[PDB]
Coordinates of C-alpha atoms in Angstrom, one line a residue:
Chain G
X1 CA 26.7 -16.6 45.4
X2 CA 24.4 -15.7 42.5
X3 CA 26.0 -15.2 39.1
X4 CA 23.4 -13.9 36.7
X5 CA 23.4 -14.6 32.9
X6 CA 23.5 -11.8 30.4
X7 CA 20.3 -11.9 28.3
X8 CA 21.0 -12.5 24.6
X9 CA 20.6 -9.7 22.1
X10 CA 16.9 -9.3 21.3
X11 CA 15.2 -9.1 18.0
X12 CA 13.7 -5.8 17.0
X13 CA 11.2 -5.1 14.2
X14 CA 9.9 -2.1 12.3
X15 CA 6.4 -1.6 10.9
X16 CA 7.5 -1.8 7.3
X17 CA 8.4 1.1 5.0
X18 CA 6.9 4.4 6.3
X19 CA 5.8 7.6 4.4
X20 CA 8.0 10.6 5.1
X21 CA 6.8 12.3 8.3
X22 CA 4.8 9.2 9.3
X23 CA 5.2 7.0 12.3
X24 CA 6.3 3.5 13.1
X25 CA 5.7 1.0 15.9
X26 CA 8.8 -0.7 16.9
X27 CA 8.6 -4.0 18.5
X28 CA 10.5 -6.7 20.4
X29 CA 10.4 -10.0 22.3
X30 CA 8.7 -10.2 25.7
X31 CA 11.2 -11.2 28.3
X32 CA 10.0 -12.0 31.8
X33 CA 11.6 -9.8 34.5
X34 CA 12.9 -7.4 31.9
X35 CA 12.9 -3.7 31.6
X36 CA 13.4 -2.2 28.2
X37 CA 15.2 0.8 26.7
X38 CA 15.3 2.0 23.1
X39 CA 18.1 4.3 22.0
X40 CA 18.6 6.5 19.0
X41 CA 22.4 6.2 19.0
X42 CA 24.7 3.2 18.5
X43 CA 26.5 4.4 21.6
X44 CA 23.3 4.1 23.6
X45 CA 23.5 7.6 25.0
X46 CA 20.2 9.1 23.7
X47 CA 17.1 7.4 25.1
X48 CA 14.0 7.3 23.0
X49 CA 11.6 5.0 24.8
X50 CA 11.2 2.6 27.6
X51 CA 8.2 0.5 26.6
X52 CA 8.3 -2.8 24.8
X53 CA 6.7 -1.8 21.6
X54 CA 6.8 2.0 21.4
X55 CA 5.7 4.2 18.6
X56 CA 8.1 6.7 17.2
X57 CA 6.8 9.7 15.4
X58 CA 8.0 12.0 12.5
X59 CA 10.3 9.6 10.9
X60 CA 11.6 11.3 7.8
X61 CA 14.7 9.2 7.0
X62 CA 16.1 5.7 7.3
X63 CA 16.5 5.9 11.1
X64 CA 18.1 3.1 13.2
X65 CA 17.0 2.2 16.7
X66 CA 18.9 0.2 19.3
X67 CA 17.4 -2.0 22.0
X68 CA 18.7 -3.0 25.3
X69 CA 16.9 -5.6 27.5
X70 CA 17.9 -5.6 31.2
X71 CA 17.0 -8.5 33.4
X72 CA 17.6 -8.7 37.1
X73 CA 20.2 -6.0 36.7
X74 CA 22.2 -7.4 33.7
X75 CA 22.0 -5.6 30.3
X76 CA 22.2 -7.3 26.9
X77 CA 24.2 -6.2 24.0
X78 CA 21.9 -3.9 22.0
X79 CA 19.9 -5.3 19.1
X80 CA 18.7 -3.1 16.3
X81 CA 16.1 -2.3 13.7
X82 CA 15.8 0.2 10.9
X83 CA 12.7 1.9 9.5
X84 CA 12.9 2.3 5.8
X85 CA 11.2 5.2 4.1
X86 CA 9.2 4.7 1.0
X87 CA 10.7 7.1 -1.6
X88 CA 8.9 10.2 -2.9
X89 CA 6.6 9.4 -5.8
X90 CA 7.6 11.0 -9.1
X91 CA 6.4 14.5 -10.1
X92 CA 3.0 14.2 -11.9
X93 CA 2.6 14.9 -15.6
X94 CA 0.4 17.8 -16.8
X95 CA -0.3 19.6 -20.1
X96 CA 1.6 22.7 -21.1
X97 CA 0.2 26.2 -20.4
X98 CA -3.1 26.9 -22.2
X99 CA -4.6 29.8 -24.1
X100 CA -8.3 29.4 -24.6
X101 CA -11.1 31.7 -25.6
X102 CA -14.1 32.6 -23.4
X103 CA -16.8 30.1 -24.0
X104 CA -14.7 27.1 -25.3
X105 CA -13.5 24.1 -23.2
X106 CA -10.7 23.8 -20.6
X107 CA -9.6 20.2 -20.6
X108 CA -7.2 19.1 -18.0
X109 CA -5.8 15.6 -17.6
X110 CA -2.8 13.6 -16.5
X111 CA -0.9 10.6 -17.9
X112 CA 0.4 9.2 -14.7
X113 CA -1.1 6.2 -12.9
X114 CA -2.0 6.7 -9.2
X115 CA -4.0 5.4 -6.3
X116 CA -5.7 8.7 -6.5
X117 CA -5.4 12.2 -7.8
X118 CA -6.0 15.6 -6.3
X119 CA -6.6 18.6 -8.5
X120 CA -7.4 22.1 -7.3
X121 CA -8.0 25.4 -9.2
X122 CA -9.2 29.1 -9.7
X123 CA -13.0 28.7 -9.5
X124 CA -13.2 26.0 -6.9
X125 CA -12.3 23.4 -9.5
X126 CA -11.7 20.2 -7.5
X127 CA -11.2 16.7 -8.7
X128 CA -9.8 13.3 -7.6
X129 CA -9.7 11.8 -11.1
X130 CA -7.1 11.1 -13.8
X131 CA -9.3 13.0 -16.2
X132 CA -11.5 15.7 -14.4
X133 CA -14.7 17.0 -15.8
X134 CA -14.3 19.6 -18.5
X135 CA -14.6 23.2 -17.3
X136 CA -16.3 25.8 -19.4
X137 CA -13.9 28.6 -20.3
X138 CA -15.4 31.4 -18.2
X139 CA -13.1 34.3 -17.5
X140 CA -13.4 33.4 -13.8
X141 CA -11.6 30.1 -14.5
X142 CA -8.3 31.7 -15.5
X143 CA -5.4 30.9 -13.2
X144 CA -3.2 28.1 -11.8
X145 CA -4.4 24.5 -11.8
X146 CA -2.5 22.2 -9.4
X147 CA -2.0 18.4 -9.4
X148 CA -0.6 16.0 -6.8
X149 CA -0.5 12.2 -6.8
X150 CA -1.2 9.6 -4.2
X151 CA 0.9 6.4 -4.7
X152 CA -0.2 3.0 -4.1
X153 CA 1.4 2.8 -0.7
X154 CA -0.4 6.1 -0.2
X155 CA 2.6 8.5 0.1
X156 CA 2.0 11.8 -1.8
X157 CA 4.1 13.2 -4.7
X158 CA 5.3 16.7 -5.0
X159 CA 2.9 18.9 -7.0
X160 CA 3.1 20.3 -10.5
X161 CA 0.9 23.0 -12.2
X162 CA -0.6 24.4 -15.3
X163 CA -1.5 28.0 -16.2
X164 CA -4.8 28.6 -18.1
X165 CA -5.5 32.0 -19.6
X166 CA -9.0 32.6 -20.9
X167 CA -9.2 35.5 -23.4
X168 CA -12.4 37.7 -23.6
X169 CA -14.6 36.8 -26.5
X170 CA -15.0 39.9 -28.9
Chain F
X1 CA 19.6 -34.4 37.2
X2 CA 16.9 -32.8 35.1
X3 CA 16.5 -34.1 31.5
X4 CA 14.1 -31.9 29.6
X5 CA 11.8 -33.2 26.9
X6 CA 11.8 -31.8 23.4
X7 CA 8.4 -30.2 22.6
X8 CA 6.7 -31.8 19.7
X9 CA 6.5 -30.1 16.3
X10 CA 3.7 -27.5 16.5
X11 CA 0.9 -26.9 14.2
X12 CA 0.9 -23.8 12.1
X13 CA -1.9 -22.1 10.2
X14 CA -2.4 -19.5 7.6
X15 CA -5.3 -17.1 7.1
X16 CA -6.5 -18.7 3.9
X17 CA -5.7 -17.6 0.3
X18 CA -4.4 -14.0 0.2
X19 CA -4.6 -11.4 -2.6
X20 CA -1.2 -10.5 -4.1
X21 CA 0.4 -7.9 -2.0
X22 CA -1.9 -8.5 1.0
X23 CA -1.2 -9.8 4.4
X24 CA -1.8 -12.9 6.5
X25 CA -1.9 -13.7 10.1
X26 CA -0.1 -16.8 10.9
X27 CA -1.0 -18.7 14.0
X28 CA 0.1 -21.5 16.3
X29 CA -0.6 -23.5 19.5
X30 CA -0.2 -21.8 22.9
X31 CA 2.5 -23.6 24.8
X32 CA 3.1 -22.8 28.5
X33 CA 6.7 -21.7 29.2
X34 CA 7.4 -21.3 25.5
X35 CA 9.0 -18.7 23.4
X36 CA 8.4 -18.6 19.7
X37 CA 10.3 -18.0 16.5
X38 CA 9.0 -17.9 12.9
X39 CA 11.6 -18.3 10.2
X40 CA 11.4 -17.7 6.4
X41 CA 13.9 -20.4 5.5
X42 CA 13.8 -24.2 5.9
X43 CA 17.3 -23.8 7.4
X44 CA 16.0 -21.6 10.1
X45 CA 18.5 -18.8 9.5
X46 CA 16.2 -15.9 8.6
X47 CA 14.1 -14.8 11.5
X48 CA 10.7 -13.2 10.6
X49 CA 8.8 -12.9 13.9
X50 CA 8.9 -13.9 17.5
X51 CA 5.3 -13.6 18.5
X52 CA 2.8 -16.4 18.7
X53 CA 0.4 -15.2 16.0
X54 CA 2.3 -12.6 13.9
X55 CA 1.0 -10.8 10.8
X56 CA 3.2 -11.0 7.8
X57 CA 2.8 -8.3 5.2
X58 CA 3.3 -8.0 1.4
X59 CA 2.9 -11.6 0.5
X60 CA 3.0 -11.8 -3.2
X61 CA 3.7 -15.5 -3.7
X62 CA 3.2 -18.9 -2.1
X63 CA 5.5 -18.3 0.8
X64 CA 6.3 -20.9 3.5
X65 CA 7.0 -20.1 7.1
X66 CA 8.7 -22.3 9.7
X67 CA 7.9 -22.4 13.4
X68 CA 10.1 -23.3 16.3
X69 CA 8.8 -23.5 19.8
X70 CA 11.4 -23.4 22.6
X71 CA 10.5 -24.5 26.1
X72 CA 12.8 -24.2 29.1
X73 CA 15.7 -24.1 26.7
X74 CA 14.8 -27.1 24.4
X75 CA 13.8 -26.3 20.7
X76 CA 11.3 -28.4 18.7
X77 CA 11.7 -29.5 15.1
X78 CA 10.2 -26.7 13.0
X79 CA 6.6 -27.0 11.9
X80 CA 5.4 -25.1 8.9
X81 CA 2.6 -23.4 7.0
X82 CA 2.1 -22.0 3.6
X83 CA 0.1 -19.0 2.5
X84 CA -1.5 -19.6 -0.9
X85 CA -2.2 -16.7 -3.2
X86 CA -5.5 -16.3 -5.0
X87 CA -4.6 -16.1 -8.6
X88 CA -5.0 -13.0 -10.7
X89 CA -8.5 -12.7 -12.2
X90 CA -8.8 -12.8 -15.9
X91 CA -8.4 -9.7 -18.1
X92 CA -11.9 -8.1 -18.5
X93 CA -13.7 -8.0 -21.8
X94 CA -14.5 -4.7 -23.5
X95 CA -15.8 -3.6 -27.0
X96 CA -13.5 -2.8 -29.9
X97 CA -12.5 0.8 -30.6
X98 CA -15.3 3.1 -31.5
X99 CA -16.0 5.8 -34.0
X100 CA -19.0 7.9 -33.2
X101 CA -20.3 11.2 -34.4
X102 CA -20.8 14.3 -32.3
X103 CA -24.3 14.1 -30.7
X104 CA -24.9 10.3 -30.9
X105 CA -24.5 7.8 -28.1
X106 CA -21.3 6.2 -26.6
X107 CA -22.3 2.9 -25.1
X108 CA -19.8 1.0 -23.0
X109 CA -20.4 -2.4 -21.4
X110 CA -18.6 -5.6 -20.4
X111 CA -19.5 -9.3 -20.6
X112 CA -17.6 -10.5 -17.6
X113 CA -19.1 -11.3 -14.3
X114 CA -17.7 -9.6 -11.2
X115 CA -18.1 -8.7 -7.6
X116 CA -17.9 -5.2 -8.9
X117 CA -16.6 -3.1 -11.8
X118 CA -14.5 0.0 -12.0
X119 CA -14.6 2.2 -15.1
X120 CA -12.9 5.5 -15.7
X121 CA -12.6 7.9 -18.6
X122 CA -12.0 11.2 -20.5
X123 CA -14.7 13.5 -19.1
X124 CA -14.8 12.2 -15.6
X125 CA -16.8 9.2 -16.7
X126 CA -16.9 6.9 -13.7
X127 CA -18.9 3.8 -13.1
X128 CA -19.0 0.7 -11.0
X129 CA -21.5 -1.2 -13.1
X130 CA -21.4 -4.0 -15.7
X131 CA -23.3 -1.6 -18.1
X132 CA -22.6 2.1 -17.2
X133 CA -24.8 4.9 -18.1
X134 CA -24.7 6.0 -21.8
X135 CA -22.6 9.0 -22.4
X136 CA -23.6 11.6 -25.0
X137 CA -21.1 11.8 -27.7
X138 CA -19.6 15.2 -27.0
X139 CA -16.2 16.0 -28.4
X140 CA -14.9 16.3 -24.8
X141 CA -15.6 12.6 -24.4
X142 CA -13.1 11.4 -26.9
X143 CA -10.3 9.4 -25.4
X144 CA -9.4 6.2 -23.5
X145 CA -11.9 4.4 -21.4
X146 CA -10.5 1.9 -18.8
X147 CA -12.0 -1.2 -17.1
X148 CA -10.8 -3.3 -14.2
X149 CA -12.6 -6.1 -12.4
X150 CA -13.0 -7.1 -8.7
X151 CA -13.4 -10.8 -8.2
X152 CA -15.5 -12.5 -5.6
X153 CA -12.7 -12.9 -3.2
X154 CA -12.1 -9.3 -3.9
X155 CA -8.7 -9.5 -5.7
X156 CA -8.5 -7.0 -8.7
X157 CA -7.9 -8.0 -12.3
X158 CA -5.4 -6.3 -14.7
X159 CA -7.1 -3.5 -16.7
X160 CA -8.1 -3.4 -20.3
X161 CA -9.2 -0.4 -22.4
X162 CA -11.3 1.0 -25.3
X163 CA -10.6 4.0 -27.5
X164 CA -13.5 6.3 -28.5
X165 CA -13.2 8.9 -31.2
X166 CA -16.0 11.4 -31.6
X167 CA -16.1 13.1 -35.0
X168 CA -17.3 16.7 -35.3
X169 CA -20.8 17.0 -36.7
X170 CA -20.8 19.0 -40.1

């Protein structure tokens, strides 16, 4: 007669906080003779992966995964791990809408600290700086200027914008 | 009757001094038939990792890890290792606040030695030198200039800054 033991509940790990829409590698303990199953539900009815250290994509929230290790036919009580999501960085700060005259200077800047900046605009204006180069106020430069922010972890902020209206010079 | 030995306390190693917020690979001795567990606490109640040479992220202080090697069911007395953190490089030196006139020269420099420098400023001024190129004193260049320092190990300093005010030329 062979009475098999039940493997103990395994450890499970995430890959740290993840940017919304990013991915995470989940991982567990190597068990000789084992097969693995990762489930999305606490009821273990939705199967997500069968490897040992699978990568789960498109994580947009604080999702929980459950792990069952089966050895020689006996299944352990599921272990678990959660993947926390780094929150959304705060909306960037920009100046109020401008009115400038043709030939003067359009000066854009922000006051927020970031790993990096990303500015776009009407005449191809592009910058990755806190204080982008000054744009001559040509009429072609009228329009909407847009700013987004990359955080230290790297996760992007939602964008904000500035209108600039260049008046023809008499 | 089989009386199993208790494995001896294992060695454990860090990856040298680490920059604050960096990571370290911890490592230990390969033991045949062993399973591994790394703990954050001296009481061995918080489990950190189960591999042999795990990487621990976001180390911001002089953290200590404890290692238990279990062979054929018998657990050793925990070994340990610490990860020391390279201290924060000293605040950089910059000149006192400037008053310049439109059309003259804005000269920025530092007196501190570094692996590299990183300067930013009002009109897109960017430099990685101890003594950045001289900026013409245009009115668009008024504002705050900021310096940070990269140490030899590579760990960044806290920043310091200089105000420059360009007066209109009569």
